[PDB]
Amino acid sequence: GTVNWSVEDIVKGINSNNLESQLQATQAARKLLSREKQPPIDNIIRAGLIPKFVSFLGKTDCSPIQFESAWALTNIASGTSEQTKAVVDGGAIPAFISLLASPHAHISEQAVWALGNIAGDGSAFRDLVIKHGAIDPLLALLAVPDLSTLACGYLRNLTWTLSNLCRNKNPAPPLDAVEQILPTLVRLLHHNDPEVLADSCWAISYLTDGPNERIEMVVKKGVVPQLVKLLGATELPIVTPALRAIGNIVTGTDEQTQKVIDAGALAVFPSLLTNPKTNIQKEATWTMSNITAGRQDQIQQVVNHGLVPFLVGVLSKADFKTQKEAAWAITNYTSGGTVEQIVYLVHCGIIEPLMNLLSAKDTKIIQVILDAISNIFQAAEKLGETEKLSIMIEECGGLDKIEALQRHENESVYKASLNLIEKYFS
């Protein structure tokens, strides 16, 4: 009967000179800390029980108390940064790394979980876990010919902990640690378990969220095709991280973006840009805006895949944040595209939704829209069709909005709107 003990009784049992009494009190603490309703983490810390639990982690001759203390410390480290710090201050990191080699699978799994919570606190504890040498034993746990031989929950916890070791920035994980972990991540990215795939994609998304040198590290491993395949998955928990990773990769060089295009990613965007989940639509439009900012042949690839109508649709109706990303994609398109591509964009019906979005209350969207207008007008000038475009913008009510923007707080807004009125409507 280790249910509903008091912290006083737990302290009494742990302070006894009896290993079994300590085990029973530690189990009672674990059950207290594993309750969904307000676990008394702070009361357990104030009682000074963390050093005892950490010392129990090293009792190799009593694996049950090792497991119970590891579980208790895992739940303590799952709380606030101060509580995770309390666990780290007790010396738990090296003790958990030692437990990673335990012959009992459930004890090593608990150690993996605990290290995941500690690393997940932030960059400092992540790097400290790495400095204590956790990556080597962690990856050794996955050194099997077929990952399907490992228990499902075991593999899921290992993947989650590895993802936390790739997470957080300022600073990002050490380059050498990323190179150490990446091959195992690639292997996990081909596992059939949805949660393992979701956490592997999340890890890749963390690693691709950075400079082009970090993006290049990931792309060199040839994971882009697999990311695109997972981008076409049905499980939203997999698509979300895969889209974030692909979006992070297209923020890099035009050659890295091209590697994304060559894998067939654009063929999936018809569904992503119409996805019922607002965040998928927003992230997809943000990826498109970073693709339309590339070379003209890449804009042409966007055109050939029939994605301009989908951008027009998102600009016409979507969450405002998605509409903003679409406005960005249009401005990038018009800034880097040919006259023929900018003419095709107009022929697809961009002007009317572009105008309708000039009634928004966000200064940035208005600047973005008005810069796309300028680019389209420049293309019209190059074609000598400025009057046509002028008539079109006037027929849909854009003229009134631009004239009304001449009297706007932001200076860039009234100067550009006044330059447009004077250069094309006088």
Binding site: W71, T74, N75, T84, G120
Partner: peptide, 7 residues
């Protein structure tokens, strides 16, 4: 992201 082990 941290996870509490409830069971």
């Amino acid at each position: 992201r941290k996870k509490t082990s409830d069971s």
